[PDB]
């Protein structure tokens, strides 16, 4: 509703939502936006706050902050029956990872403002093999419905969790373990049919895996399991020998054609304290489990180190010209290429904090603690 800049490359504007910067007296906020479900979430150390993106719900869970993800409402695709009046009010669900306990609320409507003692009786819970004693904690979460949900821990373990059975009824089951080391990217791939979709996993060691996950009684399969670290290092070492010992893999994003991925890395030149961010386009051959680096680009408009150990930069690629957005703590860099490279930056003021993001087919949505949701729409 408020456009802050529009030029021939992009629009940056607010997205009016039910997010409020006064949900909590707590500076540290976890959160993200799910444009596909239509709701955003923030939590502190006490409560999760669920808010509509189209103009809220408080779920007390009581310490360190849990990790929360939203789930889709129980859909009944292609029924012969007339729809219920009451089925048009289900909003979707909520999963809370508190320590080693997964808590799943099928429907958040019935738990609004309920104390945890009693709302817990509305939930399905799953004890996960997380070594809380040893310092293990939930790190990334991906909603990969209709298949289910994927969790990673700060110590590299990956759980595939199912939230329906074979008949759409809510449950919470550990489907499979998909295994210092740590996952840097969990990404949705294409849906393959009833209850099945691909998920892409990238680790900081450069392991890239394509998993076929299903809620439909099938058991997970890897279609690709390769390590890209040395290939990326070799693509850089001749001009940038300081890549040796500094190459770090931050994120990855699938491209259009379903057989290629874009990876975001950095290297560091200690002579002049410059961090260089690298976009590597990689083509994967599923037949032979092999890959090649199609292209390598260095960002020219942003060379800052990421010193916030929490912040993880994130790629967005709208679904000719290819546009690659990278969200940094206080900037969004826009790169475009013929599907010559060129690059724009949107620099944010330093006194606002990004606390998560979301996306649709064309835009990146950035959740800021102090000003709510910002939309970055790249013109293609």
């Amino acid at each position: 509703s408020k456009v802050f800049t529009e030029n021939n490359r992009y629009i940056v504007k607010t997205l009016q939502t039910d997010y409020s910067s006064g949900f909590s007296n707590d500076d540290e906020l976890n959160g993200y936006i799910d444009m596909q479900i239509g709701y955003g979430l923030v939590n502190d150390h006490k409560k999760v706050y669920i808010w509509n993106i189209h103009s809220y719900i408080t779920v007390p869970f009581r310490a360190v902050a849990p990790r929360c993800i939203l789930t889709f409402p129980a859909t009944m695709d292609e029924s012969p029956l007339a729809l219920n009046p009451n089925d048009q009010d289900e909003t979707g669900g909520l999963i809370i990872i508190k320590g080693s306990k997964a808590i799943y609320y099928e429907d958040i409507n019935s738990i609004n403002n309920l104390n945890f003692k009693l709302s817990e009786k509305f939930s399905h819970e799953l004890e996960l093999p997380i070594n809380s004693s040893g310092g293990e904690k939930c790190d990334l979460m991906l909603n990969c419905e209709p298949a289910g949900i994927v969790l990673s821990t700060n110590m590299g373990r990956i759980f595939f969790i199912t939230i329906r059975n074979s008949m759409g009824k809510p449950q919470l089951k550990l489907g499979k373990l998909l295994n210092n080391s740590s996952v840097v990217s969990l990404r949705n791939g294409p849906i393959l049919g009833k209850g099945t979709r691909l998920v892409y996993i990238t680790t900081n060691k450069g392991i890239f895996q394509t998993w076929q996950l299903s809620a439909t009684n099938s058991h997970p399969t890897k279609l690709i399991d390769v390590n890209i670290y040395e290939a990326i290092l070799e693509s850089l070492q001749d001009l940038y020998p300081f890549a040796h010992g500094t190459l770090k893999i931050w994120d990855s994003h699938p491209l259009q054609d379903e057989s290629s991925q874009l990876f975001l890395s950095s290297i560091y030149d200690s002579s002049c304290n410059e961090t260089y961010y690298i976009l590597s386009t990689i083509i994967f051959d599923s037949s032979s489990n092999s890959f090649t680096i199609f292209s390598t680009y260095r960002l020219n408009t942003f060379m800052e180190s990421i010193t916030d150990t929490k912040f993880k930069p994130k790629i967005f690629i709208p679904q000719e010209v290819t546009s690659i957005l990278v969200m940094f703590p206080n900037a969004v860099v826009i790169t475009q290429v013929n599907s010559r490279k060129w690059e724009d930056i949107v620099s944010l003021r330093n006194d606002i904090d990004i606390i998560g993001s979301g996306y649709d087919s064309k835009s990146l949505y950035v959740l800021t603690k102090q000003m709510g949701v910002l939309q970055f729409f790249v013109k293609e």
């Epitope: 399991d225 390769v226 032979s288 092999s290 890959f291 090649t292």
Partner: nanobody, 120 residues
């Protein structure tokens, strides 16, 4: 296929030229063409390389004596070995530095290897 030619026996201070001819399809799957030397009872060691763009590179043990070049008319790559020494005696392999990577690492291409012998 990578095909290599030009080996033989010469005296110290002599000269030989090795060549490496690559098919169209292989040339597409590599960054450059190089040569590995393997003395006997030793391991292979890369001594020369030239990128597809003609950027040459020579290992320290040969760089004042050998030249690597490409003929762009046919893509053949040549290692001209001047100032030869008895310790240049080895099998020489031409080598394509692969663009593709698998579970075992980079997928390179090898020639069959040719014998060079230098007597003193």
């Amino acid at each position: 296929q990578l095909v290599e030619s030009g080996g033989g026996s010469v005296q110290a201070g002599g000269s030989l030229t090795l060549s490496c001819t690559a098919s169209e399809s292989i040339s597409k799957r590599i960054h450059g063409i190089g040569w590995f030397r393997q003395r006997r009872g030793e391991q292979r060691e890369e001594i020369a390389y030239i990128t597809t763009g003609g950027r040459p590179n020579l290992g320290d043990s040969v760089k004042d004596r050998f030249t690597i070049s490409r003929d762009k008319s046919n893509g053949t790559v040549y290692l001209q070995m001047n100032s030869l020494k008895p310790e240049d005696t080895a099998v020489y392999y031409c080598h394509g530095r692969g663009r593709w990577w698998g579970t075992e690492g980079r997928l390179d291409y090898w020639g069959q290897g040719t014998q060079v012998t230098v007597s003193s």
